[PDB]
Structure formats: C-alpha cells, structure tokens
Design an enzyme around this catalytic site. Sequence first.
Site, short mmCIF file in Angstrom:
data_model
loop_
_atom_site.label_atom_id
_atom_site.label_comp_id
_atom_site.label_asym_id
_atom_site.label_seq_id
_atom_site.Cartn_x
_atom_site.Cartn_y
_atom_site.Cartn_z
CG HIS B 59 -1.44 -43.28 -51.04
ND1 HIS B 59 -0.45 -43.81 -51.96
CD2 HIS B 59 -1.97 -42.17 -51.83
CE1 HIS B 59 -0.11 -43.16 -53.00
NE2 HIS B 59 -1.12 -42.11 -52.98
CG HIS B 61 -4.39 -37.26 -53.00
ND1 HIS B 61 -4.36 -36.91 -54.35
CD2 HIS B 61 -4.73 -36.27 -52.27
CE1 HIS B 61 -4.44 -35.63 -54.16
NE2 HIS B 61 -4.76 -35.34 -53.17
CE1 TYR B 122 -16.18 -13.89 -53.35
CE2 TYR B 122 -17.80 -13.15 -51.86
CZ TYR B 122 -17.39 -13.51 -53.16
OH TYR B 122 -18.32 -14.14 -54.10
#
Lengths: 125, 125
Positions: B59, B61, B122
Amino acid sequence: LYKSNHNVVYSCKYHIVWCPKYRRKVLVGAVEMRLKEIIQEVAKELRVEIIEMQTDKDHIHILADIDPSFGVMKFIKTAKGRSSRILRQEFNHLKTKLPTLWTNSCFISTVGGAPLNVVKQYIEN
Amino acid sequence: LYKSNHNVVYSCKYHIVWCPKYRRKVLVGAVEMRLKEIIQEVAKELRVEIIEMQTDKDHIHILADIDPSFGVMKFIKTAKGRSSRILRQEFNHLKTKLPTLWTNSCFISTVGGAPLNVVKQYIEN
DNA sequence: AAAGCCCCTAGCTTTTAGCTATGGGG
DNA sequence: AAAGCCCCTAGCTTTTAGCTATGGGG
DNA sequence: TATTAC
DNA sequence: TATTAC
Ligand SMILES: [Mg+2]
Ligand SMILES: [Mg+2]
Ligand SMILES: [Mg+2]
C-alpha cells in the site's frame, strides 16, 4: 464514520463559508430561516450531510461531509445558485437592491474525517 | 496556510491510501523508489502539494493539499493511472503477473486545513 | 488590492437565473 | 461481502493503457 | 457597476 | 478471472 460510493471509502468534512454580495447584512429574520431550509433540501438531494450550519447577518458557515467523487464545489454551486434564485424570487428586496445575492467566492477548509484513533487503522497499520 | 485560485480561498488536506491489485506485495525496492518519483512528478504538474508519502509492500499512503476546485479524484486518477502505465512498462513482472497494477478503489479521509487557532478566524467572529 | 469590487466566456441549474472554472482581464 | 474479487460502459490520460464515475451487474 | 471581511 | 485489508 466512513461511507462509500461504488469505488471509494471516504470521510471528507469541510468548513465552508460565504457571504452576500457587498457583504450586505441580509441573512436575518425570514431570509435566514428560508436560506437554511433551502440548504438542507439541497444537501438532502445531493447526499451531503450537514453537520453544522450557522448564519450571522453577513455570512453563513456550514460544516458538511461530502463524497469526494461528487465534489465539494458541486455542492457549493448548487447551494449558492439555488438559494440565490429562490430567495430573490421570494424576497423582492433581495432582487431589487442587489445584482446577485452572493459573490463568486467562498472559503473552504478541511476538517479531520474521523478521530485519530479511527483513521490510524486505515493509514498506518 | 491558505491558498487561493481565482475564486476560492482554501486549505484541503487529505490522507489517501490505495493498494496493488490482489493486495500483491509489489511495492518494494526499485518499484517503490520509482513509484514515488512518478507521483512526485504528477503532483508537481497538477499543483498538488505532497506533505508526506510512504509505501509499505502492499500500500501507499499520501498526505496531500489539493485545490478543491481541481478535485482530489482528479489527482488520484492521474497518480494511479500514470504510475500503473509507467511501472508496468518498466517492470515487466508487474505487467505479466497482473491484469492491472492497482484496483478501482482507494481510501480518502480529510485532515484539518490549518491549526484551530487560524481556522476560527475564518469561520467565527 | 482580491475572495470579496468592476468586466469577460461558457457549462449547468429540482435556479433557464445565477451560480461555477486548479477559468480569464482590470 | 466489497473497496478490495469477477463482469460492464463512457471519459480521459498513461493511448494494441489503465485509471475514474456521488457510474453500473454479481 | 463599487465591497472591505467570515 | 479470484483478493481478504492499509
Ligand atoms: Mg464496482
Ligand atoms: Mg475573478
Ligand atoms: Mg459609494
């Protein structure tokens, strides 16, 4: 925690904030109420989960979980464009005093998709 | 912390994880080295910032900051599709022992766009 | 100046008006 | 079962390829 | 056809 | 044309 479409497993949460044209303080009273109602309906139709939605006279903030293949921008343009058209039809003062209800801009910031203890299982081992 | 395109101010970070077809342990040695180079080149070309990228035998990532208007899926499609093409051309065993290098799936989880201190500015008064 | 103001094109809208576009000009 | 395995169609890059699509069948 | 920052 | 989980 995680949802999936035919091909992707995901959890994509965003803080989304936008304001009325000219920063007019029009998100009050009946307008504020109807706006939320239209956003909830758009979200329902678009398979978007509204986690939080706050309004103040001059801005609306939404925290939503949105399928990444669908696109946060697709939800935003529908929420904004539909709310604009509908609200301007229903509240004439919004149509006569402004060229559009919203601006062409918005603010977007991702939020953790799940707590660290959960995400760890998927990204580390 | 926040970037902007013509119409949007944003910071959208995502953990992205995907695996080889059949979960084969092929991401080792030269394959792993070349895979990272390819994805770095894809990111550069697509204006995607790779914060971190790691691979285990089965895998990969990636933690990346991606313009929401562009779309995380467009980055994933290119990163997976191009690396499959190139790696299968370069490492014949990846082409002969597998129908495809990757699967049609991936895992995606949003990560906080900026420190809470900055985000509040924000999204709240 | 830019996200926010003015201007533009072009794709879709449970909205054919009024929003987008890693969109462009100031 | 599904994300992951088998199958399928468009669209778009990486093009006698190999990935997406809030895509579909098991 | 003119805003000032969530 | 057959995988088992990051
Ligand atoms: Mg499928
Ligand atoms: Mg502009
Ligand atoms: Mg004046």
